[PDB]
Design a protein around this ligand. Structure first.
Ligand code: GTP
Ligand code: MG
Ligand code: NA
Length: 344
């Protein structure tokens, strides 16, 4: 039932500078990419999108309202594309239920695209491809934040032909890597063929189509049990000292529910850590966990979400550690053993 709905996790993967973060900024209406050193992402990011927002941002490709939204929302995990962060792509990939693979339409598949495809294939993750930077097609005429088809229909013949040529090349490339793919509105087998959705992070065109498609992936490809909450599952992303809270952990809550005051167990350098949540915090909706802000204090947070936890004794917490909650009925040492076993 609806009071037990789970917000799924989507990872965005792709080669360096293909526009992962720029796409998320266009959706959030933020400017994270401009603040990044080097213009590159160097850590895992997480942003929560309430379904009310996704409905608004897909309205132009859902004008009558026939599309049925079932998810309460979606957590999207941003990852680096730079060669040196494979550990982070592997982590993000292992957390997600679905994914967006970003491909620069002007370049096609590149080395970390291929790395990413290996990850998606290994976990059999449902994904869609954002064929990004369509505004670089020579003579592209934009309508800001339009659906791709509406905009494509208005282009001159030369632009349409250049588009089709590049799409055909990118399809042949996916085929060579063992994936069949179709332009999204030509895909007759959403269950087995990858949908390609042309986008521009600069003009916003196609982003409504991409958001609709990732909801569809959650609702029509992700295992249906993952639409509802079950046993708590959570992963430590980072251990960071924060002004006025001391040593905190950033955590991806993958399943279940966290509560203020909860007593939690996780791996530490010198052994398991057992402590109490003094503050259970999130960013504002549609704002990055990897960005400093005023944080929202919660008594309760439901999965999936990226959270920050303040608790004594977090020094020595180990990034990548699983995290568990000691409930009214629990035996602790068992839990310690299984997180310690999963760490190794
Ligand atoms: N013309 C055009 N440029 C884009 C588009 N999307 C991204 N860019 C440019 O591409 C550059 C790289 O964008 P990023 O958002 O850093 O891409 P990324 O995939 O997140 O990069 P890494 O996280 O460093 O792997 C920036 O200069 C963007 O402004 C697009 O749709 N059109
Ligand atoms: Mg980035
Ligand atoms: Na970049």
């Amino acid at each position: 039932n609806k009071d037990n709905l789970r917000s799924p996790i989507c990872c965005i993967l792709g080669h360096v500078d293909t526009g992962k973060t720029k796409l998320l900024d266009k959706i959030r209406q933020t400017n994270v990419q401009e603040g990044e050193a080097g213009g590159i992402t160097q850590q895992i990011g997480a942003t929560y999108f309430p379904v009310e927002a996704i409905k608004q941002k897909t309205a132009v490709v859902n004008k009558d309202g026939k599309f049925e939204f079932k998810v309460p929302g979606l957590l999207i995990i941003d990852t680096p594309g730079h060669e040196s962060f494979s550990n982070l792509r592997s982590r993000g990939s292992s957390l997600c239920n679905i994914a967006i693979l970003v491909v620069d339409i002007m370049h096609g598949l590149e080395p970390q695209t291929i790395e990413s495809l290996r990850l998606l294939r290994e976990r059999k993750t449902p994904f869609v491809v954002a064929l990004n930077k369509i505004d670089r097609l020579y003579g592209w005429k934009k309508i800001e934040n339009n659906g791709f088809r509406e905009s494509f229909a208005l282009q001159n013949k030369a632009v349409q032909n250049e588009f089709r040529n590049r799409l055909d090349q990118v399809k042949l490339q996916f085929a060579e890597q063992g994936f069949n793919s179709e332009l999204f509105y030509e895909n007759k087998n959403f269950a087995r063929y990858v949908s390609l959705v042309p986008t521009s992070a600069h003009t916003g065109e196609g982003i409504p189509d991409m958001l609709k498609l990732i909801v569809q992936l959650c609702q029509e490809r992700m295992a249906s049990s993952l639409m509802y909450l079950s046993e708590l599952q959570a992963t430590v992303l980072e251990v960071k000292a924060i002004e006025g809270f001391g040593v905190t952990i950033d955590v991806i809550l993958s399943n279940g529910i966290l509560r203020e005051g909860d007593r939690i167990v996780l791996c530490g350098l010198e052994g398991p850590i057992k402590t109490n949540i003094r503050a259970l915090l999130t960013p504002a909706p549609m704002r990055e966990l990897r960005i400093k802000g005023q944080y929202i204090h919660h008594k309760e947070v439901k999965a999936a979400q990226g959270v920050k936890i303040s608790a004594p004794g977090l020094e020595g917490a180990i990034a990548g550690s699983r995290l568990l909650v000691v409930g009214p009925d629990d035996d602790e040492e068992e839990l310690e053993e299984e997180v310690e076993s999963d760490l190794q």
